[PDB]
Amino acid sequence: LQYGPLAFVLGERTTRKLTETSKVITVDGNICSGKGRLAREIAEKLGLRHFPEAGIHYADSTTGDGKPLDVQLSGNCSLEKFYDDPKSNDGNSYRLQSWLYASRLLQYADALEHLLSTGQGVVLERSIYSDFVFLEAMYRQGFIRKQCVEHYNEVKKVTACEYLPPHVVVYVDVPVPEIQSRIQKKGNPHEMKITAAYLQDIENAYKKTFLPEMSEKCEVLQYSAREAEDAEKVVEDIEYLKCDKGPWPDQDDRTFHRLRMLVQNKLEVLNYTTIPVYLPEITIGAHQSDRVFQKFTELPGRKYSPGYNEDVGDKWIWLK
Amino acid sequence: DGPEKNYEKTMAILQIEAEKAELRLKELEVRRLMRARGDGPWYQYPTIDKALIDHSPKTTPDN
Amino acid sequence: MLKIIIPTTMLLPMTWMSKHNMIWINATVHSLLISLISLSLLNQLGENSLNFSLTFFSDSLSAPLLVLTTWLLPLMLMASQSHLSKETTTRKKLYITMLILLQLFLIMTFTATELILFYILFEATLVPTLIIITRWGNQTERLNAGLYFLFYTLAGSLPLLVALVYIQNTTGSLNFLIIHYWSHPLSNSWSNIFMWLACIMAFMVKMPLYGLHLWLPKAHVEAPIAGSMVLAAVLLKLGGYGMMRITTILNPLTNYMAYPFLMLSMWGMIMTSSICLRQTDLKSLIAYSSVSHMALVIVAIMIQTPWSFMGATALMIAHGLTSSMLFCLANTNYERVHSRTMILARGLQTLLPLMATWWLMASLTNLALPPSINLIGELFIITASFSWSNITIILMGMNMMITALYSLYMLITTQRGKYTHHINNIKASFTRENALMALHILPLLLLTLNPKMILGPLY
Amino acid sequence: KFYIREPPHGSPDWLKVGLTLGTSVFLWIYLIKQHKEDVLEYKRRNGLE
Amino acid sequence: MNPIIYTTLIMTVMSGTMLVMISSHWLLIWIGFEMNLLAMIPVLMKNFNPRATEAATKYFLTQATASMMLMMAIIINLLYSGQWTITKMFNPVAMTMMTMALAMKLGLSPFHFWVPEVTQGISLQAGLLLLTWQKLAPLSVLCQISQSINPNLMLTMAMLSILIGGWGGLNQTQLRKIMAYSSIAHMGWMTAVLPYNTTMTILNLLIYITMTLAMFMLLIHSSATTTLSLSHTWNKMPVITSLMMVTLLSMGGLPPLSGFMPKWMIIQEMTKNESIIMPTLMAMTALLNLYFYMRLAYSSSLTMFPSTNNMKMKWQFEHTKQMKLLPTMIVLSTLVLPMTPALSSLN
Amino acid sequence: KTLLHKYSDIPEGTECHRKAYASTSIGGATGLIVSAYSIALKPPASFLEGVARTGRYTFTSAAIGAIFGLTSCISAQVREKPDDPLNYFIGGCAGGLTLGARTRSYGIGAAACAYMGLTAALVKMGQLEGWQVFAEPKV
Amino acid sequence: MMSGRPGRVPLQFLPNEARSLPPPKLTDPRLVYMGFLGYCSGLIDNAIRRRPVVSAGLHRQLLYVTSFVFFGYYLLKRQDYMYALRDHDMFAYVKSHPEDFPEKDKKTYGEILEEFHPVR
Amino acid sequence: LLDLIWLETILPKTTSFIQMKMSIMVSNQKGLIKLYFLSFLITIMISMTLFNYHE
Amino acid sequence: MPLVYMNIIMAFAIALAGLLMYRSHLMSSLLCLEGMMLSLFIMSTLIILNTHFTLANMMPIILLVFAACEAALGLSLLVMVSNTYGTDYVQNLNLLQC
Ligand SMILES: Nc1nc2c(ncn2[C@@H]2O[C@H](COP(=O)(O)OP(=O)(O)OP(=O)(O)O)[C@@H](O)[C@H]2O)c(=O)[nH]1
């Protein structure tokens, strides 16, 4: 049985399974600052599992086969258009930011459910608390309007407060000109078309609000590029910090029940991601919404409830 | 079918519905009478049951 | 009547599970067999109403209207898949379901025996029509249309309900047969006057009477074509039918209070007709013409003369057919032009000769060219009114005159002229619409041949 | 197959299905038994047959 | 709230209502009222927002005033009669005081401003509970003592409830407020039919209970609280809005839907009691309720509204809350009209 | 109820002064009731403007009742038609226009004519017939 | 109307006496319609859960109709008993009060002076 | 003049405007507890003997 | 219908009037509520002591029993309005108006 009120009444707690090794970490940094590398290294050094950085189709990975659905069907926005044509009236950029926010929201939801259900710790590449660095860095670059920023802040406050901050977070400090050289050597033509001011603004927004406000919520671990190169030392650092900061200690089993209830209902998590605000890049029209929803319905495995679609290979539907 | 079909069917229907009509009128009149006087099986209202009363000799003689 | 009710109800599963392509074919054909079965119901005993059961009965007034509805049901199905082609299969199936539920409610209404059951289904016709008008409407004031239509109907419907339950308490039963056979004279009490008003004003709202007729130029003009024809053709006849049923227990009072409404229609049929002349939209012109014809039917009802009743019934049937055909023609032209002002596309008689004809005898029947059932139904009412009061004739004599004017005016200004050069989307006449106007027109002349059937119970 | 995770109801619960049919047949045969008892008891009540 | 604590509080609310509906002693009925009031406040305070505190307060002090008034009536009755049995009031002042003492609990008179406030402030589930379960007890007491009501006072109460509820519902876009006003209107209907035949009151109460249950659990399953949010449900989930509009047509009472059967039967009863102006008045003024019902239906299902792109993910994820008894509730909410005479089972 | 009964005791038409006084008192009573509700739900700002509000309401209502009474009695006496429902209808437009003339509005009192006069005709018809707005439980 | 009738025992569906009445037939149109409500409830239940509303969960729909019919039978028996009781109390009160139920000295239309209104 | 002006003003629009106007004065309460309970207070003696519901 | 009853009824009437009128605070209204309860207790006690309804003397005790419970719940409500509001006044309690 999935965890509900009846399980708490029966006696299914989560403080019992949760231990010191049950940690939720995000490894954050600049663009291609080795955050995925270091996240994987702390993952299998500390024995914790790893959810990769949520993107456009991470939610596509969560449901069904996991293949990345059509871009139009899965949020009608692409990172490549962001990199190539940044400023356009279609507003693909804020659609990208909002969809990435909601995807990282569900990534954190599943991550929290994991270590609150089985007790195994979780490691991540960025999260909600590091999600705002991008949006502010873009907005400072003449990228999006302040109405999009205010919609982002209003969605953040009403869809992030019900969650609680991570256990530890690792920062991999790599200088922005080194990041420019790294993207030079990367090769993908889209990330060539980047403003170095945007990269410096990502770095600034990281170590101006993210890390400071982090330090009052959990324990921060600032590592330079060379310092984060030797992963053994960073994992032995995260082992020995104190693990005694934030709302994590003062977290009773009843608030555990609340947060498990919240994470287990995905529609609740992203219920306020679709608040009626009528933003120029957010209102899909009645006709467009009708056609796109119909297209999603004709997509296999998305017409009936998961586990009932006969077209996909289900069975026993008539006594299910 | 023949006209006798409709004739006898209308006889039965008319008789049944006329019985329904004056039964409804009798229902209205009976309800009025029983609510006005109460000397009938329904429209009775609750009253205190006598078996609750205790008749044993109390402390005060002339209770 | 369950030989017509049960198949109509079972028609719902067929469409609701038919394939993505078979819904239209299946609904059309099986509705055609339903109309064929209801064609039997034209079998009428001399004077005794056919009493199938306690709750269902029919006579020479309900049967022609029932046949009209059942024969009509394929016609909306044929007129709808043009503007309903680009829709989801489930949505199309529900549109069909709304139409079947409408027809079912109309059948139970016309075959109802108790006045309360008649009221239940009579008003219950509102809901499917409301959905059809609101959701599938294409114009702006469709949302306003639904509010206007529902509230106008209900404002009369509820006092009728109060009057009916009061009658049930007093008389004993709302059964038509009882209230007619056990009818009692009505005293000229003012409480009885208000009871008559309650029993009359609902149907007169759905008649409509002049003044409180604003729901049609704001409802029929906006509804999808299927809704428009089912409204004008039959839903208008609901008030007339109900009045014909209810005037049995509404005498001799009626005459004294017949004076205000009668002339309200008599004068009103002029203004509406005049409003028809200075119109800009085809659908509004047809709606106002429908108001005028229904006002003539109102006059026929309140005369309470045998001849008036027969002419009334004939006019209801003929007007239903003619209004449905005229609305269908207007939809064809509008869809071909995607606009409804009757000046944008003129001189299409050459381009579409069969449409030119269909419009020609549609106007002729609307103009009441003898010996069509429209003309005989009109003339019977005219003679009854003249017997009741002579001066009526000039007002009557005015009406068709003005009617004739607009009865040809749109035909002059939509096909009898020069085509507009910048438009080119007028394609060859799809034989669907031509056939549809055929199924509209041939039954009209067929009933013209034998009008003893649509002549009503007084014949 | 399609869904990476097991479905909430994908393989139907033999338990709940079993109780569903078990109660339904109970309701049906209790209904029949009750109807027979009522008809016979009504027959013997007023002494019809 | 610990789930066991919530279960105990719900059981105490239900036990207070049961104590009201099973006790003969007046003091025991008041004790049931007190237990209901005592256990109701934490249920509202479950979500713990300032709206919840505001609403729970306004709920409390009104109910406390009503219950103290109910004691004044009970004590006067005992003084003038010497009986605690719930039969009838032997002092006209006591009953013409308890009529509004039992009215603020229902929230129908000008003692109704608390209802929209508490409904909006507290959560939707506790709103369902407040608008459905918290009305059986005072209505049960009114049904027991209906034999000795001053009809003028009760009818005036019912008329004011209907009129102000229907009018106030016309000017709110929040679903909780217009449901509170709809509940006020239905209170007016049942309370109007109360003095003549309490069986029709019970029938209307049952229909309203099931139909409000269906409406509210549809709202919860749609996770909507404002008109725009509910309108947005069409893109994510259309069957909810499709059932929404049918249930709203039942709210207005349009036959052949279930909602007509009370409105119908009530009209049939009081016209038997020579009351003709009153049924016509209510029948006409129910159109104010119907107007905002159709306004809600228009911008929920009959016209699809501008959606939000992130709903592409919302369609990707299904619901988890089961919403038990909902499909049955809709069925008794729309098609029970052909089984109308079954109301004799209540009698 | 006795205050309303004052109108009942005076036969319609005759004793026009007493009937006018009784109708004025009915109007004034309704006026202070409405003004009390107004200053309760809608907050005033001070004592003197509160008196202004309640005086405006009671002035409007007392004028309405007074002119209704006067029109009714003089119309029933002049035309010798006491049972005439239209006797109250002049009280409607009198009740209408001045009410608009109390609010300095034209359409207000124009529609008030028809509305108030029609309701006055029906209430008078309540005297003519045996209508009961609050019918005691009979069946 | 009957909540105060003598001999009533509270909180029990059928008060034993009702077995003397003909039980409602299993074919009864009211009963089968209440079974139809059971089918409908299954259709919404599958539709409400994004399921193949016609074919999904045959057992769930089958349970729905069976449950409705059972409560349908008992409600119909309860419904008919009250209406029978209404007639019983009616006629018994009619017989017990002959003076309040006068009989009418029957006469034909040939002697009734029914006024005729000329329809002009 | 008649249809779109006087016929709208005579029945539908007038009633709609009346309901619109006075539903506002009904539903614009400031929500304060003090005035709500003051209105309850006034209704108390208005029902008590001002209308003489007691007798 | 004797005299002391008049004084207790009149005291309850003024306490009902005082409850139904607020000035600033929440504690004062609660005190007026418990005064209403006091008047109820005194009245009922007088009634049952006078009538020698010996089995009914428990009724004022149960009255006080639920009296204290309501007072406690009301003042906890005031605790929460103070926690979220700093003070206890009612005119500033307006967040639910819209
Ligand atoms: N607009 C936007 N883009 C984001 C956000 N988070 C991540 N991305 C994009 O997702 C990708 C993240 O890449 P990074 O992890 O920074 O770098 P990388 O090249 O993958 O290399 P590693 O950091 O070593 O994993 C880039 O395309 C980012 O622009 C966000 O919050 N907003």
Neighbours of G111 (CB within 10 A): 6
CA distance B47 to B35: 16
Q: Provide the shortest C-alpha distance from residue E305 to chain B (in Å).
A: 52
Residue with tokens 């309370």: E191
CA of A171 vs chain E CAs: smallest distance (Å): 30
Contact status, residue C92 vs residue C84, Cβ threshold 8 Å: yes
Interface of G with E (CB under 8 A): 1-3, 30, 33-34, 37, 40-45, 47-50, 64, 75-76, 78-79, 82-83, 86
Question: C281 forms bridges with which residues in the sheet?
Answer: C341
Query: Could you tell me if E334 and E258 are in contact, meaning their C-beta atoms sit under 8 angstroms apart?
Result: yes
C-alpha to C-alpha distance for E258 and G77, rounded to whole angstroms: 22
Rg of chain I in Å (alpha carbons): 17
C62-80 and C431-449 are packed helices; what angle lies between their axes, rounded to 10 degrees? 170
Reading phi first (left if > 0) and then psi (alpha if -120 to 50, else beta), residue G14 is in beta
By residue count, chain B amounts to 63
In DSSP terms, C175 is beta-bridged to C114
3-state secondary structure (DSSP) of residue A122: strand
F99: helix, strand or coil? helix
Separation between Cα atoms, residue C103 and residue C75, nearest integer Å: 12
The string over A142-166, giving b where at least 16 C-beta atoms fall within 10 Å of a residue's C-beta and e elsewhere, is: ebbeeebbebbeebbeebbeebbbb
- How far apart CA I8 and CA I36 sit, in angstroms, is 10
Q: Mutation test of the interface with chain F: which of E148, E149, E272, E274, choosing the one with the most F Cβ atoms within 10 A? A: E274
SS3 label, residue C386: helix
Contacts of H6 in chain C (CB under 8 A): none
Q: Which amino acid does the sequence have at A265?
A: N
Interface partners of chain B (CB pairs < 8 Å, 3 or more) are: C, E, F, G
Q: Which of F1, F40, F111 is facing H38, going by the closest CB pair?
A: F40
Q: Which of E316, E319, E320, E321 to mutate to test the interface with A (most CBs of A within 10 A)?
A: E316
Task: Evaluate whether A128 touches A163 at the Cβ level (below 8 Å).
Answer: yes
* Chain position carrying tokens 């499917």: C128
Q: Please tell me which of the candidates F37, F133, F137 has its beta carbon nearest to residue E196.
A: F137
The C-alpha atoms of residue F138 and residue E311 are separated, in whole angstroms, by: 59
Helices (H), chain I: 4-19, 27-51, 58-85
**Ligand 1 first shell, C-beta below 6 A:** A 31-37, 53, 79, 96-97, 100, 125-126, 131, 134
Phi, psi of C281 (to 5 degrees): -115, 140
Q: What are the residues whose beta carbons fall under 8 Å from the beta carbon of C295, sequence distance 6 or more?
A: C207, C208, C209, C210, C265, C266, C268, C269, C272
End-to-end Cα distance, chain H: 54
Sequence letter at residue A108: Y
Q: Which residues partner with A24 through β-bridges?
A: A122
**Domains of chain I by start residue, with CATH:** 3-92 (1.10.287.3510)
Ligand 1 center from residue A31 Cα (angstroms): 6
Cα separation, A268 vs A261, in Å, equals 9
Inter-chain residue contact C190 with F131, CB threshold 8 Å? no
From the CB coordinates, do chains B and H have 3 or more pairs under 8 Å? no
Using CA positions, which residue lies closest to atom 19 of ligand 1?
A32
> What is the number of other CB atoms lying within 10 angstroms of the CB of residue I89?
15
| Per-residue burial over C281-319, b = 16 or more CB atoms within 10 Å of its CB, e = otherwise | bbbbbbbbbbbbbbbbbbbbbbbbbebbbbbbbbbbbbb
Q: What is the DSSP string of C146-199?
A: HHHHHHHHHHHHHHHHHHHHHHHHHTS--BHHHHHHT--PPP--HHHHHHHHHH
From the annotation, which residues of A make up the binding site? 30, 32-36, 53, 83, 97, 104, 125-126, 131, 134, 138, 186, 191
**Interface contact I98, partner H, CB < 8 A:** yes
Ligand 1 atom at shortest distance from the alpha carbon of A82 = 1
Resolution in A: 3.4
Give the C-alpha separation, E258 to E204, whole Å.
Answer: 10
Type of residue at G54: V
DSSP assigned state of B59: S
- DSSP for chain G reads --TT-TT--SS-SS-SGGGGSPPPPTT-HHHHHHHHHHHHHHHHHHHHTTS-TTTS-HHHHHHHHHHHHHHHHHHHHHHHHHHHHHHHHHHHHHHH-STTS-------TTTS--------
Residue C210 has, within 13 A of its CA and on its CB side, a CA count of 24
- Chain B to chain C Cβ contacts (< 8 Å): 42
Residue A28's DSSP bridge partners are A171
CA F11 to chain centre: 17
Which among G5, G97, G100 has the least Cβ separation from residue B41? G5
Neighbouring residues of C104: CB distance < 8 A, sequence distance ≥ 6: C5, C8, C9
Measured between alpha carbons, how far is C150 from E284 in angstroms, rounded to an integer? 13
Sheet holding A122-124, edge to edge: A49-50, A122-124, A24-29, A168-173, A219-224
Tokens found for residue C69: 């509805």
Q: What Cα–Cα distance (Å) separates residue C149 from each residue in C100, C156, C208?
A: 20, 12, 11
A3 three-state secondary structure: coil
Work out the number of other CB atoms within 10 angstroms of the CB of residue A34: 18
Ligand 1 pocket mutation pick from A26, A28, A35 by most atoms within 8 angstroms of CB: A35
Neighbours of chain F (3+ CB pairs under 8 A): B, C, E, H
Query: How far is Cα I77 from Cα C446, in angstroms, rounded to an integer?
Result: 81
User: Are E136 and E105 contacting, i.e. CB atoms less than 8 angstroms apart?
Assistant: no
Long-range contacts of F77-82 (CB under 8 A, 24+ apart): F77/F13, F77/F14, F77/F16, F82/F11, F82/F12, F82/F13
CB A176 within 8 Å of CB A196 = yes
Residue (of E113, E103, E209) closest to E164 by Cα position: E113
Give dist(CA C23, CA E5) in Å, integer. Answer: 55
Under 8 Å CB-to-CB from H25, ≥6 apart: which residues?
A: none
Judged by CB atoms closer than 8 Å, whether chains meet at C214 and H8 is answered as yes
In degrees rounded to 5, what are phi and psi of residue A169?
A: -135, 135
Left, alpha or beta for A194 (phi > 0: left; psi -120 to 50: alpha)? beta
Residues in chain F: 139
Within C281-372, where are the H helices? Answer: 282-303, 306-337, 353-366
Q: Which residues of F31-48 are buried (b: 16+ CB within 10 A; e: fewer)?
A: bbbebbbbbbbeeeeeee
Coil vs helix vs strand at C397: helix
Contact A312 D9 (CB under 8 A): no
Way the structure was solved: cryo-EM
First to last CA, chain I: 49
Among E113, E196, E274, beta carbon nearest to F132: E274
Which residues, listed in sequence order, are joined to residue C341 by a DSSP beta bridge? Answer: C281
Q: For residue C438, what are the contacts with CB-CB under 8 A and spacing of at least 6? A: none
Q: Compute, in degrees rounded to 10, the torsion defined by CA atoms A124, A125, A130, A136.
A: -150
